[PDB]
Design a protein around this nucleic acid. Structure first.
Ligand SMILES: [Mg+2]
Ligand SMILES: [Zn+2]
Ligand SMILES: [Zn+2]
Ligand SMILES: [Zn+2]
Lengths: 672, 673, 668
RNA sequence: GAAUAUAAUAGUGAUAUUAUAUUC
C-alpha cells in the first residue's frame, strides 16, 4: 500500500505537470512510478489510448523495472514490453512500441531509432519517465532525447509532446559556490527536462524519516608512512629505466599522478620519433615503448604501495613481469626483468618486515575491529578507487589475523569490453546474492556504482577509503545504510578529500535551500523562465555546431604504435555504419595474428569472435578485434593503435578516436 | 501542569523504581519535567507516618532560581514545602532547621559541601533523594564529587543509616581521554561509580517521539586561509622588538610574535624580572617597575596581534588605543610616556594600514558570506555566534555594527560575570536583560557569546549556530545542539586551523564511543554492574584514604610589591581568617596602600567587599587585594599573587601563586588581639 | 526594573516609616511598589539588627505570584523569602519558619490561626506588615482580626514594638455614605482599622500615571424586557400544578426572588411537619420537599429565561429532570416528570421560533457585532451574575451564526467545596492562559473575580450583563482595560442597575474628595483622631447561653429518618462534628468526594447521604482525620427534635445549636 | 466540614434567604 509521501511525490505528476521528483534513495521510487503510470494510462477516454516509456540506463534496473511493471499492469488491459541492446536487432522497433502501452527502454535504443528514423517523433509517447534524471545533461543519451524533444518544442511545434517525469535523489548544483548559482544550475536542469515542478516531501517528513535514516558520517585523517625504503629501491629502478631510455634516445616525483601524466606524454612523443632507417626507428621506438610501460607500471606499484601493502605492489610488479615474460622474451625486456630480479630479494626482505606497515590500513583495521567487536552481525561495504586496490585490500583482509571474522567479497565493473578484466553481470549477481547476513560474505569490497542501482543487502557500516565523489553520489550512497544507527567512515590522508566532502555537504545545503526557494515561485512565471533558458541553450547549442574540416584525400600510412611496422594504407580502409573501421586486401591479413576474444558479445550487426594483434617480430600490440559482420568475417581496428604517417610530408600524427581523424573515409561495400 | 511525553516516562521509570540512575537524554528534551515526575512519585510513595526529603543540585544561580520557582509553584499545591539555599542566603542562617523544615531543597553544591565540612549537616541520611543537575561534573575536585565522596565514605565505611537514592541528569556522560570502546566503558563505569549509579537511562522505545521533539542540527565545516599580507603585524612586531631592546638596555637579560608561546615567555620574563636584586634597592624599584611596564606593553602588543589575526586590524588597534588610554589618566611616568609616544609615532601608519580595504580578514569575509546567505534565505533567522575571548566578542559586535553588508543584524552580547575583583565581564541582570531581548520579535537578531557552563537556561531557539575558531569537548558539543532543536537548524564551524576541524571530528567519534558503550552497559545484568561499581568505589576509596602535610617556616619574611618592590608588610603582621583569607595588622600597613570603591560589592562568606586596595608609593597603583567588612572589623585582605616574598636572613626573593603553597608560620586571626 | 516616578512617590511615605494606605489605579504596578518598600525597609537596619516582613495575599494565585516575584527579587540581596498557605500549613513549625525567614508571604487565615493557637505569641516578631487589597480590613475579615490583635497590643499596656503597617488598594470605599462627611468618616474608620496615618496617592506625577493607566469610556444600555410571556405561562401553570399537588397533601408572582425566598421558607416550614404516624410524616415531608424543590427549579428556569434564551431555561430543566432520574425511582418524581414531559413539545415549539428573542441578547449581539466589525482583534470580557447564565450565554454565542467570529471561554469560581460544580484552579489558569490576542479565545464569559487578582490579557471591551457592584469593584474592573480606547458597556433592563452604578460614580467622587481633604490635615491631629476611633472600637469590641443538656434526635430533613442522637455527637477542634457508634454506619451511603482537599487535619474522602429508601439527602462528608476514618455532618442537613417535648427546630449553623457539645477524644 | 466578604431581596434594625466569590 502507498505511503502518504509517495502519493505526495506523485501528485504533481498525476496532475499532468512535467515534474522532477527528488526524494531520498530507497524511499520507494518504483511504486511512485507505478502510481504515476497507472493514473496516466487510466485517464484517457475510450477513443484514445496512452503510451508510456520508462528510461533506465542500467541493465539490472532495466530488468527489475521491466519485471515489476509487467507483473503489475497485467491485471489491467496494458501490455508491457522491454528493449535493450541484447534484443535490439532485426526486430521491428516501431511495431514493438506501437503494440505495447508500456515500454521499458535503454535510452540509447531510442536515440539510435530517433536518429535512424524508425521512430519519427516522440509524439508516439504520452509519458516519458527518466530514471536518475540528473544525468540529463551534456552528451548523455537522456540529453539527446531531450534535445529531440526541445527541438520539436521550439521548432514547428505542431505535433504534441509527452509529459515528462524525472526521478532522482539529488539534482546536483554543479560547480556552484552560492545559492544563486545553484539555483541557476537547478533551473537549467529543469529546462533540460522541460520540468515546471520539483516535487519533494514536505507534509510527510515524519513518515519519510521513519523509513529512511541519515547515517552518521565520520572523518578520519591519518598520516602517510613516514619511511618508505620500498619507494627508495623502486625509484632507483625507475631512474635506471629512464636512464636507459635516455641512453637509447637523447630527447616530477615518483609515485604520483603527475609522473604518470608525464610518462604518458613521453610515450606519446616517442611513438612519433622518426628516423631515415626504419629498422633502427622500430628498435628504438619499441625499446622506448617498453621503457615507458615499465616506468608506468613502477609508478602504479608505488601508488598501490602507498594506498595499501608493499606486498600488493610487489605482487602487482610480479604479475607484470609475468605478463611480459609470457608475451615473448626480448633482450631489453630481459634486461629490465633482470633489473627487477636483483632487487627482488631486497624488496621481499623489506616487505616482510612488520616495521613497514601502512597506518591507513591500521586505522581501517581499528575501525573494523571496533565495529565488529561492538556488533558481530555487522554488514560492511568498503569503497576504493581502483580494482587493483580492491584485490589488494581483499588480500590484506584475508591475510590479517586480526580480521578473521571478515568474509570479504568483491564488486567491480565489467571492465573494458576488449580486455580480460573486470567482472561479468552474472558474477556480480552471484556475489551480490551471496552478500547477505545469512550469506557467505560479511564485507563487500567495491570500486564504485553508477547511481543508486539495484538495492543490495543493507550495510550498517560504509567505509570510504581514499574516496572522492560529487554531492549526488554522496546523497545516493546513504541508501546503502537506511537502517537507523548506520555509520559512514571517510578514511584518508590527503586532507583535500575531507575538504571536498565538506564542500559537497555545503552543496547539499545549497541544493535543498535552492529547491525550497524555487518551489515558492509561481508555476507560469517559472515556465516562462524555463522557456527562455531552453531557447538560450538551444541557441548556444545550434551556434556550437561548427562543421567544416575538409577530409584529407591524400593517402596515408598506418604504422604500429609499438614497432612502427606498416599496418596498411588509408586507401584500404573502409567505414561500416559510419562508426567502425575495417581493412580490405589479403595483404593486411598477414600483418596480424588472432586470439580468442575474452568477452564475446553481439554488438550492432557485429559478433566479436577474436582480438587481433600485431604479428611483426613478437610485437603483439592490440590493434582491434575480429567480427562476423552480416555475411562477411572481417577485422575492425582502432586508430589509437596506429600512427598516421602520410607518404608526402612524412610526418607522424596520433589520434585517439576516428572522429578526429579527418580523411577520405570510403564507405564499406559488400560488392568489394 | 502539562502532560508527560512517553520518553520522559521511559527516562523516569528506573528512578521511580528506586534505582540509582543516570538519565542521559538530548538537551531540551524536557529534563525539568522528568525531575518533577521523579520527585512527585518519590514524595507520594511514603506512608502516613513517614516523609521524604529531596535535594536538588544546580551549580548555577540562574538554574537554581529557575528550579526553585518551578518546584515551588508545582509542589505547593501538593502540600510540600519547597525552599532553596544559595551563597547569598547561606550565612547566619540555621541550615539544619531549613533542611529539616522543608520537603524539597534546591541547593548550590558548595553549600552542602561547606555544611558537611562544618558539621551543621552531620549526614546525607537526612535526605531520601538527591538529584544532580549536569551530573557529568561529578569528577575530580568538583563539589558534586566532594558530596559523593561523603556519600561513598558513609556507604563503604562502618557508617550506616539509610543513604538517599541518587539521580543524575545529563545529555552526555563523556568518555574522558578514551581512544576506544573499552576505555570509554571504563570511564563511564567510573562515573557511575562516582555517582553510585546502577542504571543508565536513555530513550529507546520512544525514539520517534523524541526525534519529533528534538532535532539534531546539520553541522558544516568551513576551512579558510589566514590573511597573507600583514603590515600591521610588521609594525607591531617592530614596536615589540624596540620595547624588548629597551628592556635589555636597562637590565642584563640572557618564539615568534602573536602566539601563546610568546605569551608564556613574556609572563615568565615578567615573573623573573620581579625577583631582580640590587644593593641600592631604590634603583631596584625603578628597574623592576620599568621592566614590568615593558613586559606589560609587550603582552598587550601580543594580544593586539592575536585580535588582529582573528578579527579586524581596527579591533586590535582600538584594543591598543584603549590600553594606552588606560595607561594615560592613571598618572605620569617617564617610561609610560616614552612607550606611549613610541606608539603614537607608528599610530598614523597603523591607522592607514587599518583603513585599507585590501587587508580585510578573509575569515570575517567568509563569516559575512555565511550570515548573508542564511539571512537571505530566511530573514527571520535567529543566530548565535560563539567566540573564544571577550575582546573578540566586542570586536565582532563592532564589526557587525560597522559592516553595511550586515545591516540586517541586531547584535547582542553574552559573556561571563568576569573576575570577581575586576570591572570586566557582565552582571547577571545584564545577561538577563539581553537574553530577554533576544527573540524573533525582540531587539536582537544575533547573539555574540563566549561560552556557557553546561546547558543553562533555555534561551530563544537558534536556527543558526556559528562556532568561530571554537574548540570544546564532546559534552559541550552535544549540549550546544540544544540551541537549535528545531528541524532545519544549522551549525557552522568556521576556522583557519585544521586542528580545530580534526578536534571536532574526534569529538564526534567520541560521541559514537559514548553511545555504543552505554548501549553495551545497558545489556549487562544490574547486579553484576552493581558489583563492578562497588569494586571501583572500594578501590578509589582505598586510594583516597591515603593519597601528607609539610612543615612551616617561623623565620620572618617581607612582602614587597611585585611592581615597585616596595615594602608592604611583614609576615609577622599577617593573620589568617577561616584558613583561607589573609589580613594585615598594624597602622604601618595603612600608609602603604590607596583604595577605590569595589566595582562588584558582593558578600562572600562572612565578608563584604567595600573596596580594592592598590600600592600607594609614587602612583604605583598595583593591585594588592581588597578591603572588606568582616564581622565588626573593617580590614584589608590581600592575595599573595600581588607580592614577592623576601626572606630577612638569606635575602632570597620568591614568588607564590596561592597562599596554600606559601608555607610560613600562619597565625590564626584572633579578635582578642 | 527601573521605577516610574509615581511609584517612588507612592512608596515615599512608606519608606519614611509611616503607617500608610496606598491608593492608586489598578495596574499601575503595586508589586514593584511593594518591592521598593520591602527592599528599603530591610536594607535600612544596622548590622546588629534585622527586619522581618510579612506580606498578606488573600488569594492563592496572588499568593504564589508574589511568593515567586519576592523570591526571585530578594534572593540576591541576601534575604530568605518563604510562604505559607493552607496546603502547607499543617504539621510544620510555623514559629521556626517565620523566625528563619526575612520575608514571609502569607494567607491571613494562617496568621489568625497561629495567633489564636499561640505558636506566634506576638506580632512583634514582624517589623513590617503589608496588606494586599487592604480595603478588606473590615468586619470579621481575617485582616481585621489580625489588626484586632495588633490594636489590642497597641492600646493595651504592652510595650512591645509593633510593625509598620502598609495597605495596598485601588479604592478604600465609602460604605453607604450619602455625603462627603460620612465618606470621610468611613475612610477615617478604615485608616483606624489599619492604624494608618497617611493616605498615599499620586499627585506630582499624574501625567505619567495617566499615560500608563487609561480610564475606559463607560456606556449605559437600557433595553426593554420580554414582551412575550408564553413560555412563562406554560411554566407558570406547571408551577401551580405542582403547587396544587403540594397543597393537596397538607393544610396551608412567579419567576422572581420573592417567590424563591417564599418557597425556601415553605420548604423549611414543611421540614418540621409532624404527625402521630411517623412513616406518613416521612412520606408527606418527602413529598413536600420534592414539590418545593421542583417549584424552586421552575422559578430558577424562569429567571434564566428572562435573562437568556428559553432554550437555556429548558435545558436547565432538562438537566434537572435528568439528574432526578439516575438518583432513583420515586412515585412523585415520576408523576412530576410525566407532567413536564407532556408539555415538553409545546415548550420546544415555543423555544424554536425565531420571533422569540430577548431584546437584551439582540442588543448584546448588536454591540458585539459593531465592536468586532470595527475591530476584529477585539478582546472582550463579559460579566454575568450566575454560572448558569455563563453557560447559557456561552451556548447562545456558540449557537448564533452572527457571532461566528467569537471564541468564547469560561471563567468561574471554584464553587462550593463539597459539590461537583465550579472550576478548579489549574482549569482557570488553563483558560486564562488561552485567553489572549493570539490565543484560542477572543471573548471570556465570567461571573466575578475577587478584587484585582492576577493580570490577565487586556480587554479593550468589557460588558456588564445585568451586573451591579460596589464602588471598589467598579474602580477595580477598570484594570481589565488599561489601554486607551477601552470601552465598558453596562447592559440591563432595570433602571435600578444604572442608578446604582451612577451612585457608585458619585461615591468615587466622594471618596477622592474625602481623601484629598484628609491629606491636608496635620498628621499629628489625624493620628489623634485615629487613636480615638481605635479606642472607641476597642471599647465596643470588648463588650459582654446555657447549653441544653437534654438529649436530642437528629432527623433527616428530607425523609425525617433518624440519623443519630446528640449524645453520639463529638466535636473536633471546636468546629467540626462527628458521630460515634456502629449504628450510624447503617444509616448512610457514600460517594467518592469530587473535590478531595486536605483542609486542617482533615482529608476529604467522600460525601455521605441518607440511605433509607434512596433518600440520598446530603448529610455531610467522610474524612481521614489523623488515624481515624470518620464522618463529619452539617447541622443544616438535619431537623433537631427534643425527646421530652417533641419540638422540632432547625439550625443553619452548628454555633447556633446550643446543646451540650462533648469534645472528641481518641481514648473512646 | 467550617469560616469570611460582596450584591440583590425581605425587615426599623440585630438579622435572615439566595446568588457570587474567597479562605482554612
Ligand atoms: Mg439560577
Ligand atoms: Zn607491431
Ligand atoms: Zn607598588
Ligand atoms: Zn433521608
Amino acid at each position: 500500500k502507498p505511503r502518504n509521501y509517495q502519493l505526495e511525490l506523485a501528485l504533481p505528476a498525476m496532475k499532468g505537470k512535467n515534474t522532477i521528483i527528488c526524494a531520498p534513495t530507497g524511499c520507494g521510487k518504483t511504486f511512485v512510478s507505478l502510481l504515476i503510470c497507472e493514473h496516466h494510462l487510466k485517464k484517457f477516454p475510450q477513443g484514445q489510448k496512452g503510451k508510456v516509456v520508462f528510461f533506465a540506463n542500467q541493465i539490472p534496473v532495466y530488468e527489475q523495472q521491466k519485471s515489476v511493471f509487467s507483473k503489475y499492469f497485467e491485471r489491467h488491459g496494458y501490455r508491457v514490453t522491454g528493449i535493450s541492446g541484447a534484443t535490439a536487432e532485426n526486430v521491428p522497433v516501431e511495431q514493438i512500441v506501437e503494440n505495447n502501452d508500456i515500454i521499458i527502454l535503454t535510452p540509447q535504443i531510442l536515440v539510435n531509432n530517433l536518429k535512424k528514423g524508425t521512430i519519427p517523433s516522440l509524439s508516439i509517447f504520452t509519458l516519458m519517465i527518466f530514471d536518475e534524471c540528473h544525468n540529463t545533461s551534456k552528451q548523455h543519451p537522456y540529453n539527446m532525447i531531450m534535445f529531440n524533444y526541445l527541438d520539436q518544442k521550439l521548432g514547428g511545434s505542431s505535433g504534441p509532446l509527452p509529459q515528462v517525469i524525472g526521478l532522482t535523489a539529488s539534482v546536483g548544483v554543479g560547480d556552484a559556490k552560492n545559492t544563486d548559482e545553484a539555483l541557476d544550475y537547478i533551473c537549467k536542469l529543469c529546462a533540460s527536462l522541460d520540468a515546471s515542478v520539483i516535487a519533494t516531501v514536505k507534509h510527510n517528513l515524519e513518515e519519510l524519516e521513519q523509513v529512511v535514516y541519515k547515517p552518521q558520517k565520520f572523518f578520519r585523517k591519518v598520516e602517510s608512512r613516514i619511511s618508505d625504503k620500498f619507494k627508495y629501491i623502486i625509484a632507483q629502478l625507475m631512474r635506471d629505466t629512464e636512464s636507459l631510455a635516455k641512453r637509447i634516445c637523447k630527447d616530477r616525483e615518483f609515485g604520483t599522478q603527475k609522473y604518470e601524466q608525464w610518462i604518458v606524454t613521453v610515450q606519446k612523443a616517442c611513438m612519433v620519433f622518426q628516423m631515415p632507417d626504419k629498422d633502427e626507428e622500430s628498435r628504438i621506438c619499441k625499446a622506448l615503448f617498453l621503457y615507458t610501460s615499465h616506468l608506468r607500471k613502477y609508478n602504479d606499484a608505488l601508488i598501490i604501495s602507498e594506498h595499501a601493502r608493499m606486498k600488493d605492489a610487489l605482487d602487482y610488479l610480479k604479475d607484470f613481469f609475468s605478463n611480459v615474460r609470457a608475451a615473448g622474451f626480448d633482450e631489453i625486456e630481459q634486461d629490465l626483468t633482470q633489473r627487477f630480479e636483483e632487487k627482488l630479494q631486497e624488496l621481499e626482505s623489506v616487505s616482510r618486515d612488520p616495521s613497514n606497515e601502512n597506518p591507513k590500513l591500521e586505522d581501517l583495521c581499528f575501525i573494523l575491529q571496533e565495529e565488529y567487536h561492538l556488533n558481530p552481525e555487522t554488514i560492511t561495504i568498503l569503497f576504493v578507487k581502483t580494482r587493483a586496490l580492491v584485490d589488494a585490500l581483499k588480500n590484506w583482509i584475508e591475510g590479517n589475523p586480526k580480521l578473521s571474522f571478515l568474509k570479504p567479497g568483491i564488486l567491480t565493473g565489467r571492465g573494458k569490453t576488449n580486455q580480460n578484466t573486470g567482472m561479468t553481470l552474472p558474477a556480480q549477481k552471484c556475489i551480490l546474492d551471496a552478500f547477505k547476513a545469512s550469506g557467505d560474505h560479511n564485507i563487500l569490497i567495491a570500486t564504485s556504482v553508477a547511481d543508486e542501482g539495484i538495492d543490495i543487502a543493507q550495510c550498517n557500516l560504509v567505509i570510504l577509503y581514499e574516496y572522492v565523489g560529487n554531492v549526488i553520489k554522496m546523497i545516493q550512497t546513504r541508501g546503502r545504510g537506511r537502517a537507523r544507527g548506520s555509520k559512514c567512515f571517510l578514511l584518508t590522508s590527503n586532507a583535500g578529500v575531507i575538504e571536498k566532502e565538506q564542500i559537497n555537504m555545503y552543496k547539499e545545503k545549497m541544493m535543498n535551500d535552492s529547491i525550497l526557494r524555487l518551489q515558492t515561485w509561481d508555476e507560469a512565471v517559472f515556465r516562462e523562465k524555463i522557456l527562455h533558458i531552453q531557447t538560450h541553450e538551444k541557441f548556444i547549442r545550434d551556434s556550437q555546431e561548427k562543421p567544416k574540416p575538409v577530409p584529407d584525400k591524400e593517402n596515408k600510412k598506418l604504422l604500429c604504435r609499438k614497432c612502427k611496422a606498416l599496418a596498411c594504407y588509408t586507401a584500404d580502409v573502409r567505414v561500416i555504419e559510419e562508426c567502425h573501421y575495417t581493412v580490405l586486401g589479403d595483404a593486411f591479413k598477414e600483418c596480424f595474428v588472432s586470439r580468442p576474444h575474452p568477452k564475446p558479445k553481439q554488438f550492432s550487426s557485429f559478433e566479436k569472435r577474436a582480438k587481433i594483434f600485431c604479428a611483426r617480430q613478437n610485437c603483439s600490440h592490440d590493434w582491434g578485434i575480429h567480427v562476423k559482420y552480416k555475411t562477411f568475417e572481417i577485422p575492425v581496428i582502432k586508430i589509437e593503435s596506429f600512427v598516421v604517417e602520410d607518404i608526402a610530408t612524412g610526418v607522424q600524427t596520433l589520434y585517439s578516436k576516428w572522429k578526429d581523424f579527418h580523411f577520405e573515409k570510403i564507405p564499406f561495400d559488400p560488392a568489394e
